[PDB]
Every structure is written in structure tokens, then in C-alpha cells.
Ligand binder design. Structure first.
Ligand code: HEM
Ligand code: HEM
Ligand code: KNS
Ligand code: KNS
Ligand code: H4B
Ligand code: H4B
Ligand code: ZN
Lengths: 416, 415
């Protein structure tokens, strides 16, 4: 059975057969659509031999298909090897080549990611020999240096040892490797990034001496083998930052703003053939709107729309003057201008969505489909003047995948 | 099974029990979400046999009599058997006036893609079920337009023409909206006017109309009654309220020679109440600013004026990363709102309307147990994340009475 999606701006129709290879669940039913639920039960993540060999077998069939060796002796011996390894140890180990394929395909299968045109070029760093938090810090420093590359950003992922019994998890407690602190003042206001207030407090309680500035890079909080997490400060020479100025508005620099160059997600779970890699930091480069729209202008974030509009001397009395819309565009112009001027890799939302449509059509041609989550692929500003807005998209879950997991401070059993 | 939606700006959590009363289907399964498909088969609508018709009536009458706190009462059971008897004999049935009004209001209440539903109970229902000819349809539609326009003080309205019988005597308004601008192919291949209406504009000519071939020519009405060939009628221009578009800061904006009509009046949908199908049911309210400025003016496959506006703003149109499209987009939408407001024609900006919708959701969850809502359509086509609906989880499910899509009649008419 086949399915069709249509682009209502260009009338291009594509045919999806890939959804037939879908295993996980969306959360929807015939009678309700959960398409706009942030964390459906099925996108989040303690696993036994009963269900593990079929998950391994399915992954290995995919793997040997991709290398044009399905049904080979290499394929069958690998299955036997994994079979024997599971029933004898209740888990198994991925070969290097399998891990690389798996991580690339978890990105390829991330239906909420607009940047997937680049999926085949992920640099995979195997840190499965890591045993301590100090070792984790070292791998992460090397990741940040490699990915940053003096502003010429490169996609990378570092993969720490997989889950075993759930009591020896590796976890990076930060949501991103590089993020600014948030401090709730007694008067109710917030200094810094309001999204990071809870994590900042854990850091301070774990012993972090906080500078209490508006743009303090948080320390790494790293958990190895289920032990209590430990604090580490990233060397500042490794944290590339960009001061934000505007090409026409000279007062913009006086707003005191800056952002870091490297977006590096560190709290997701990487699932490959049933194995769970609970610490797998990955990084790429920013789409301008992620900073200029969400980070700066979300009411629940830095929320600088007011002061930018103030300095632009906009009619702020009534919403119908669209002062919020006007200032939002200016802020995003400045983010793109600052990054490009410092030769730090960045992509605007017009270029990124255009690339994603090309990627998506190619994936239909050569793969039979491309799972995609319209709610997340459409940019948070200027939606209908980008080509993804008019693009029908089929959302379904393929593995390998990145999954959400609970925040570790809510589940950790403290040693003391 | 009693589902919850969270707003990630406010942490407000609502509990949805209304979805359990859902009858129709979403297009999705547990293996694939079709939440971004424009028209899944379920959202479109051939005989309705005597069988499935009475359950559909009972369900509707049950919620109707519940809403007036007379569920399981004298009048309720009498109406049930009355409709039961009329279906048993005539193979259809006729709604009381009160049930028609309730049905129309609730089809709007249940339109999960409509951001404007906070106003749902104020709908003015015009019963046109006594209409028999296109000239009579024209009369009802002129009265609708005049009532809804109200010299700029727009009022919500729907006019309900006779329900489908055997599918051969169908009432249809062939226009997609009562008021739309013509669109013309050019010798050099471009397009004058509105490209979405190029085919319809040619049907009108290729069947009688003589086009003035301007850039904003109001289309004639093409009205089909009882299944006959449709007939052309011109809406009296004095009934068509238009707004010239100028900018509050840029004097040159006036020179662009833009205008738009004040009355959004959708005329090609199907209204379903208690199993009965109302194939001609034009309804109208008032615009949200971005419908004109973002989609009508700046869609590539529409008027597509971004280029010209940015040129007159002397923006660096060399690279996409100058965000010249975004900057021009905001100015256009400022102009639309400023023009409408200056001319005292009702309009709402996307900040006000999405805020109204959150309040509406609050109200529906409090007094009804939920509110079906389609995030893909509710979030405005610009400035999405600086509006509260962007951060609002919404559950999408299909309740009846409802508005549904139907085929374009010229693909179907026994000509
Ligand atoms: C290289 C440039 C990249 C760009 C421009 C990009 C852009 C984006 C954007 C805009 C989102 C939407 C989430 C949000 O706006 O908060 C997203 C989501 C996501 N990205 Fe990418 N991304 C890139 C690279 C990567 C890489 C290297 C990976 C993993 C190897 C990745 C995995 C994901 C995943 C899993 C999500 C979905 C998160 C979820 O399901 O909630 N991305 N990306
Ligand atoms: C009074 C002010 C109103 C406003 C501001 C408003 C706004 C909107 C908007 C912005 C949409 C999205 C569709 C698009 O972007 O083209 C929509 C959809 C819709 N509106 Fe409303 N509307 C209003 C009144 C009404 C009324 C009076 C009715 C019927 C009684 C109605 C029925 C619908 C339906 C059925 C849809 C969705 C069609 C579908 O399912 O695809 N609306 N509305
Ligand atoms: C617990 C609730 O979480 C909710 C969900 C949402 C999480 C947002 C999010 C989660 C991810 F996993 C992720 F990868 C990205 C993409 C960021 C990114 C990554 C890379 C590599 C490049 C690039 N350009 N951008 C964003 N957050 C607002 C609150
Ligand atoms: C044939 C292709 O179909 C695709 C689908 C899509 C459908 C467009 C559409 C269909 C509706 F039913 C509807 F109600 C509206 C809302 C417009 C409206 C109505 C009122 C009363 C007030 C107001 N402010 N706005 C829009 N259209 C772009 C092309
Ligand atoms: C393919 C996609 O569903 C299509 O572009 C939808 C997206 N959301 C929309 N939202 C509104 N309000 N109006 C539309 O026409 C659309 N079009
Ligand atoms: C409720 C809703 O699902 C939530 O706000 C989503 C909407 N779409 C999004 N899209 C992107 N790219 N990033 C987001 O965080 C969100 N948030
Ligand atoms: Zn769905």
C-alpha cells in the first residue's frame, strides 16, 4: 500500500512506501490527532532478552542491506554472533561500522529536524571505552573543539557506553553542552536564560561558584556508570561566542547581547538495534531563528522584544501596529549579520527550508519516503513564505532514532 | 484516556474529555500521522441510505435536547419518534428552525481549523430552505452580503439552502467565496489579477461573463439550484465593501494600487447536521489581517507582491539572509490592518485573534470538556512563535455537526 503527499505551491506529488517499514508508534489514532503534543508517550524513553533479538535482527538486516550484503555469510555469522552474545550476556556490542551507520540513520530518521540534508556527513566519535566523568569531560572537550573548528562548524556526535541494567547509566545532565545560566532573583525577575534556572540551581548546589552574569557558560555536569555527577568547566578558549550587532542599528550592540556558536544537544537518547545510548551529545550549526526568534524573543526566554521595540521607537501601545513582528525581524537580521561577519557557520530559515525540500524529494526518490513533522519543520517566523509550509508531510517513527528521556535529577539514586 | 494538553509558555494544563464523543475519523493511525494533509478523505463528502440516517439523527437530537436541559424528556422522546417516523416514510427528515440554528452554530463551534470560534454562538442563521431557483439564491445571497457587511461593522452569518435529496437536485454556489477577484492568463504567460481564480475566471467567461480584465475585478456569482445549469449574476457593487490599501508610514504604498474586499464569505463547503447534507451554505465573518497580507498578497501562487514592495523599500534583495522578504512581509501586514481600521471595516490582527482563541479554549475546556483544534491551521502564517497558540498543545478530532469539503461542481455536474 502506497501513500501520496502534495506540495500545494508547486503541485509536485510524491509517493511514500517507506512508512511500511515503520515500527514505533505516533501517538495518534483513527479518532484523535496528537500531531502537536510536545512529548507524546512514544517519543520518550529496562529491556529484556524477550524483545531484544528481533530489534537486533531488524537493525542488522537494515545494516547489511545498506552495504549490499543482505543474506551474505558475513550477515548470517553476525546474526549468530549477536544471537549468542545476547542470550549469554542479555545484551550485545555494536561493531564500529554498525555504530556509525546507526547514528547517521538516527539523524536521517529524525522527523522533526529540518537540517537532515547533511545527515550522511556526521562525524561519529566512539567513546564507548569511557569509564569516568573525567574521561567524559575529555571526550566532550575534543568534540567541542572538532565541531567548532574555528567557526567553520562540523557536525559531530560522541557516543558513550550504552545502558546495561539502567543502574549504570552514562548521562550528560546539561540539556546542551553550551548554554547560559539563569538566576531567579528575589524580586521575581530573572538574570540570564530563564530556560536554565532549574539546572543552574543544581549546579550551584553541586558546588558551582556562579559569576551571576547575564551570559555565563554553565559547567558540564557529567555522570559516568551511574555514579553521582561531577562538575567541570569547559575551557573558555573552546567556547566560540558571537557578539550581536545590527548592520544598520548602531544602538543594537549596546544591548549587551551575545550567543554561542555551537548548538550541541546532550540530553537525548540514541536507540540502535534495541541498545540504548543514554549519553550521545551531538552538534551541528544554527538556523538563525533558533536564536533570534526562540532564544531571544520567547516570552519565557530572554524576552528582549520589549527593549528592542523601545529603542526602535515603535508604536507599542496596540498590538495591531505589529511592533512585535517588526522587532522580531530586526533581531533575526542582527543574529545572521553577526554570525556571518565573524565567519561562524549559520543558515537562515529561507535557505534551510529550501534545502530540506530538496532533501525530502531526494529521499522520496532514493528511499521511498522521508518522515517529517510539519509542526516542527515549519520555522517559527515567516512560515508561509518558506516552501515547507505548503508541503504535505507524513510523520512516522523509524529506527534507529533519537528519543527523549527523563531529566536525570528526577530519576537518579544518589550515592553521597 | 482523559487526555491532557499543556501550554509550554504558561504551564496551564487542560483535561480533554470531549474527544470521547468524536464520531468521524482523523486520517491518522498509530503508525502514521497525517496531521499536515490538506484534505484527507474524511474531511470531504453518494446516497445516504435509510439505515445510517436514523442513528445520525438520534445522536444530533440527543445533544440538541441535552443542550436545552431537556434530555430524556417529554418533548425529546416525541421528537425522536417523530423524526423516526418521518425517516421511516419519507427516507429523510426536516429540521425544526431551532435545530437548524443549533446545528449551524455547532458546526462552527466544531471547526477545529478555525481560529475565530470564540464568536461561534453569535452566528446569524438565514433559513433559505424555501428557495427553488438561482434567481432566488441570488436574492438570498445579496441579503446575506448586505446584512453581514453592515457598512463595515461586519456580522457573522450563514445562509442555508435546501438540503441534498437524491444528489441530482443539488444546490451549489460554484464560487469558492462570494467575493473573489478575477484572474487572467496573459499572452506572455504571466497572470493579471488573482491566479487562484484563473480557472474559475475562465469558466465564467467560457459560459457568459464579459470580464473588465482589471487587476481587482469582482467575480460574478455562478449559482446552481435544484441541479440545473448554473447562472451568472453580478453582485451590486454598492454591496461589495472594499478597502484601498495604504501604509501609515510609507506614502508610496498607496501608489501600489492595492485593495481587498472586506467580506470573507466561504461558499463551497458542505454543512452536515444530523445526517443531512447542506451543499450550499455560504458563511461569512471578518478577516484576520494575515489572511490578506500574508497569503493573498505574498503567496508565490497568488498576488506575490513581495518583490515590488521590497524594491520600493530599497532592501538588499541580493541574499536571502538579509531577510528582505520578512521585512517587507511585516510592512504589508501593517498596511492591511491600518487600511481596514482607518475605513472602520472590521478586522483582527493575528496577536488579538490567537489570544482570543486561547481564552476560547479555556472556556470550552471549562464548560464543554474540550475544544478540537488543528495546530497546523490555527498557528498564523507569520510570527508563529510570538503568538500564544504556538506554545499550545491542541488535540484534533472530528465532531458533528460539521463543515466538510466537497468536489468542485464543474468536475461533477451532469451538464
Ligand atoms: C547541522 C545543522 C542542523 C540544523 C540547522 C538543525 C536544525 C534543527 C531544528 C531547527 C530543529 C527543530 C527543533 C527546535 O527548533 O528546537 C531540529 C531538531 C532536531 N535535530 Fe536537527 N539540526 C541540525 C543538525 C542535527 C544533527 C547533527 C543531529 C543529530 C545527529 C540533529 C538531530 C535533531 C533531532 C533528533 C531533532 C528533533 C528533536 C525532537 O524530536 O524534539 N540535528 N534540528
Ligand atoms: C468571524 C471571524 C472569523 C475569523 C477571524 C476566522 C478565521 C479563520 C481562519 C484564519 C481560518 C484558517 C483557514 C485559512 O487560513 O484560510 C479559518 C478556517 C475556518 N473557518 Fe473561520 N473565521 C471566522 C469566522 C468563521 C465563521 C463565521 C465560520 C462558519 C460559520 C467559519 C468556519 C471556518 C471553517 C469551517 C474553517 C476551516 C475549513 C477547513 O476545515 O479546512 N469561520 N477561519
Ligand atoms: C523536555 C521538553 O523539551 C521541550 C522540547 C524542546 C526541545 C528543543 C530541541 C530538542 C532537541 F533534541 C533538539 F535536537 C533540538 C534541535 C536543536 C539543534 C540541534 C542541532 C544539532 C543543530 C541545531 N541547529 N539545532 C531542539 N524544548 C523547547 C522543550
Ligand atoms: C481547492 C483547494 O483547497 C485548499 C484548501 C484551502 C481552504 C481555504 C479555506 C476553506 C474554508 F472552508 C474556510 F472556511 C477558510 C477560512 C476563510 C475565512 C472564512 C471566514 C468565514 C472568515 C475568515 N476570516 N476567513 C479557508 N485553500 C487555501 C485551498
Ligand atoms: C500542506 C499544508 O497542510 C498546507 O500548506 C496548510 C498548512 N496550514 C495552513 N493553515 C491555514 N490557516 N491555511 C492554509 O491554507 C494552510 N495550509
Ligand atoms: C505545543 C507545540 O507542539 C510546541 O510549542 C512546539 C511547536 N513547534 C515547534 N517547532 C520547533 N521547531 N521547535 C519547538 O520547540 C516547537 N514547539
Ligand atoms: Zn496525527
Amino acid at each position: 500500500r502506497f501513500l501520496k503527499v502534495k506540495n500545494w505551491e508547486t503541485d509536485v506529488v510524491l509517493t511514500d512506501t517507506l512508512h511500511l517499514k515503520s515500527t514505533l508508534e505516533t501517538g495518534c489514532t483513527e479518532h484523535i490527532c496528537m500531531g502537536s503534543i510536545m512529548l507524546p508517550s512514544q517519543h520518550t524513553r529496562v529491556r529484556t532478552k524477550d524483545q531484544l533479538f528481533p530489534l537486533a535482527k531488524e537493525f542488522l538486516d537494515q545494516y547489511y542491506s545498506s552495504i549490499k550484503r543482505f543474506g551474505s555469510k558475513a550477515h548470517m555469522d553476525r546474526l549468530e554472533e549477536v544471537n549468542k552474545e545476547i542470550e549469554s550476556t542479555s545484551t550485545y556490542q555494536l561493531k564500529d561500522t554498525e555504530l556509525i551507520y546507526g547514528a547517521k540513520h538516527a539523524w536521517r530518521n529524525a522527523s522533526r529536524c529540518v537540517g537532515r540534508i547533511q545527515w550522511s556527513k556526521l562525524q561519529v566519535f566512539d567513546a564507548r571505552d569511557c569509564t569516568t566523568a573525567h574521561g567524559m569531560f575529555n571526550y566532550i572537550c575534543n568534540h567541542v573543539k572538532y565541531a567548532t573548528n574555528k567557526g567553520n562548524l562540523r557536525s559531530a556526535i560522541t557516543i558513550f557506553p550504552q545502558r546495561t541494567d539502567g543502574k549504570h547509566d552514562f548521562r550528560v545532565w546539561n540539556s546542551q553542552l553550551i548554554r547560559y545560566a539563569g538566576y531567579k532573583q528575589p524580586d521575581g525577575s530573572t538574570l540570564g536564560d530563564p530556560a536554565n534556572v532549574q539546572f543552574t540551581e543544581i549546579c550551584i548546589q553541586q558546588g558551582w561558584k556562579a559569576p551571576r552574569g547575564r551570559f555565563d557558560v554553565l559547567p558540564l555536569l557529567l555522570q559516568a556508570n551511574g555514579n553521582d555527577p561531577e562538575l567541570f568547566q569547559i575551557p573558555p578558549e573552546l567556547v566560540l561566542e558571537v557578539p550581536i550587532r545590527h548592520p544598520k542599528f548602531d544602538w543594537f550592540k549596546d544591548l549587551g547581547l551575545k550567543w554561542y556558536g555551537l548548538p550541541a544537544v546532550s540530553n537525548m537518547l540514541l536507540e540502535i538495534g534495541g541498545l540504548e545510548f543514554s549519553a550521545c551529545p551531538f552538534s551541528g550549526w544554527y538556523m538563525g531563528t533558533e536564536i533570534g526568534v526562540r532564544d531571544y524573543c520567547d516570552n519565557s526566554r530572554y524576552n528582549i522584544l520589549e527593549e528592542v521595540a523601545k529603542k526602535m521607537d515603535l508604536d507599542m501601545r496596540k498590538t495591531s501596529s505589529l511592533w512585535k513582528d517588526q522587532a522580531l525581524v530586526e533581531i533575526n537580521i542582527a543574529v545572521l549579520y553577526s554570525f556571518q561577519s565573524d565567519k561562524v557557520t549559520i543558515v537562515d530559515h529561507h535557505s534551510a527550508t529550501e534545502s530540506f525540500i530538496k532533501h525530502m524529494e531526494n529521499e522520496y526518490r532514493c528511499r521511498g519516503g522521508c518522515p517529517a513533522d510539519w509542526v516542527w519543520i515549519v520555522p517559527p517566523m515567516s512560515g508561509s513564505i518558506t516552501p515547507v509550509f505548503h508541503q504535505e508531510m507524513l510523520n512516522y517513527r523509524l529506527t534507529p532514532s533519537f528519543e527523549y528521556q527523563p531529566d536525570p535529577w528526577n530519576t537518579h539514586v544518589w550515592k553521597g
